[PDB]
Amino acid sequence: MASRILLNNGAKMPILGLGTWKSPPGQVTEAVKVAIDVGYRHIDCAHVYQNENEVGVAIQEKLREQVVKREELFIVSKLWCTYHEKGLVKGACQKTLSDLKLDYLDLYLIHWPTGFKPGKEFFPLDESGNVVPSDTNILDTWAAMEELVDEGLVKAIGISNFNHLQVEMILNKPGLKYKPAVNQIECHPYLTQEKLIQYCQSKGIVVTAYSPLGSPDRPWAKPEDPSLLEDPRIKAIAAKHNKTTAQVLIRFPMQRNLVVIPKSVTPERIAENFKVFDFELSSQDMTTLLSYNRNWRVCALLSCTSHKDYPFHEEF
């Protein structure tokens, strides 16, 4: 298993990264320090996670300790939905860079295709609980992202939570300057994404799988929801390999030529989750895990189902 995948800008992206959504600010600095100590070189960030300063502290410390140099790290962040207007994009990127204490990002993603009304609130609501959209569109936001590459703020740009038609809209954009390098999407045995992965990979777009463990800490979880980490069928595959269920769930997307970004703030789990380069899932294991698909999302952006750019009405 080579540890990096080649992107369209010529750069190599580590296939295993550390996720940081729901990593509380008071716990995430140590998590990122441990991750770097045990070998992670890719960190998945976002302004909306409200913890980029604390991520940046950890990175700074490890640079100053001589543990890693900047060129070996692969730092990803994402443009939040309230900043899709072309005149807001650069400032949003520069705020992430300032918080992270970096002079460039390796990859910057449009976090969701949906633009929201600009303002302080991340999910601005009217008086009936509907997300207030903005008058923004994918193509104009993409053009603003391209400017970030041309100014040296980011090495590559990509998208997240885009369906294949939304990806196609960018690919077919008149005067396209940069193709998306990555589409970061939810992917796990209950939502295997066969059609969207096939589409993206056929267009030379690398796919990153988010919520690979099923996001058991997501804030809207219901007790009756399916649970990957507790699935006895996956536990049995793990036992046969003398690995944990989480390790199987991380190895799975790696064998599909995906990047994967499991999140933890628990030092033992951070180290456990990286120890996935010493075993292989069999053809039968892969087939079996793919067979668990139920088209089941844990991140369905349910407050935005009437937005013009809501991504999940399309089959893929």
Ligand X SMILES: NC(=O)c1ccc[n+]([C@@H]2O[C@H](COP(=O)([O-])OP(=O)(O)OC[C@H]3O[C@@H](n4cnc5c(N)ncnc54)[C@H](OP(=O)(O)O)[C@@H]3O)[C@@H](O)[C@H]2O)c1
Q: Which residues are annotated as a binding site for substrate?
A: 111
> Least distance to ligand X from the beta carbon of 312, Å?
12
Of 39-58, which residues contact ligand X (CB under 6 A)? 44
Concerning whether 49 is annotated as a catalytic residue, the answer is: yes
Q: Which of 86, 90, 179, 269 binds ligand X (CB under 6 A)?
A: 269
Q: Measure the CA–CA gap between 184 and 159, rounded to whole angstroms.
A: 6
Quick check: 305 binds ligand AVT (CB under 6 A)? no
Token pair of 124 as six digits = 């601005």
Quick check: 256 binds ligand X (CB under 6 A)? no
Q: Which of 84, 243, 256, 263 binds ligand X (CB under 6 A)?
A: 263
From the annotation, which residues make up the binding site? 10-19, 111, 211-273
How many positions of this chain bind ligand AVT (CB under 6 A)?
12
Q: Which of 5, 46, 89, 265 binds ligand AVT (CB under 6 A)?
A: 46
> Least distance to ligand X from the beta carbon of 216, Å?
5
The 94-133 contact track toward ligand X, x by CB under 6 A, reads -----------------x----------------------
Of 169-228, which residues contact ligand AVT (CB under 6 A)? 220
Quick check: 21 binds ligand AVT (CB under 6 A)? yes
Nearer to ligand X, 113 or 133 (CB): 113
Residue 57 touches which of ligand X, ligand AVT, none (Cβ within 5-8 Å per kind): none
Quick check: 20 binds ligand X (CB under 6 A)? yes
Nearer to ligand AVT, 80 or 274 (CB): 80
Question: For residue 86, how far is the Cα from the chain centroid?
Answer: 23
Q: Which of 132, 271, 286, 299 binds ligand AVT (CB under 6 A)?
A: 299
Q: For tokens 């189902």, what's the residue?
A: 305
Nearer to ligand AVT, 265 or 289 (CB): 265
Quick check: 21 binds ligand X (CB under 6 A)? yes
Q: What is the 3 state secondary structure string of the chain?
A: CCCEEECCCCCEEECECEECCCCCHHHHHHHHHHHHHHCCCEEECCHHHCCHHHHHHHHHHHHHCCCCCHHHCEEEEEECHHHCCHHHHHHHHHHHHHHHCCCCECEEEECCCCCECCCCCCCCECCCCCECECCCCHHHHHHHHHHHHHCCCECCEEEECCCHHHHHHHHCCCCCCCCCCEEEEECECCECCHHHHHHHHHCCCEEEEECCCCCCCCCCCCCCCCCCCCCHHHHHHHHHCCCCHHHHHHHHHHCCCCEECCECCCHHHHHHHHCCCCCCCCHHHHHHHHHCCCCCCCCCCHHHCCCCCCCCCCCC
Question: Residue 135 corresponds to which amino acid?
Answer: D
Catalytic residue among 49, 83, 178, 199: 49
> Least distance to ligand X from the beta carbon of 38, Å?
13
Please check whether residue 166 is in contact with residue 114, taking contact to mean a CB–CB distance below 8 angstroms.
no
Quick check: 301 binds ligand AVT (CB under 6 A)? yes
Token pair of 179 as six digits = 């193709």
Nearer to ligand X, 177 or 230 (CB): 230
Q: Measure the CA–CA gap between 289 and 34, rounded to whole angstroms.
A: 30
Catalytic residue ranges: 49
Q: Which residues sit at the interface with ligand AVT, rule CB under 6 A?
A: 21, 46, 48, 50, 111, 122-123, 220, 299, 301-303
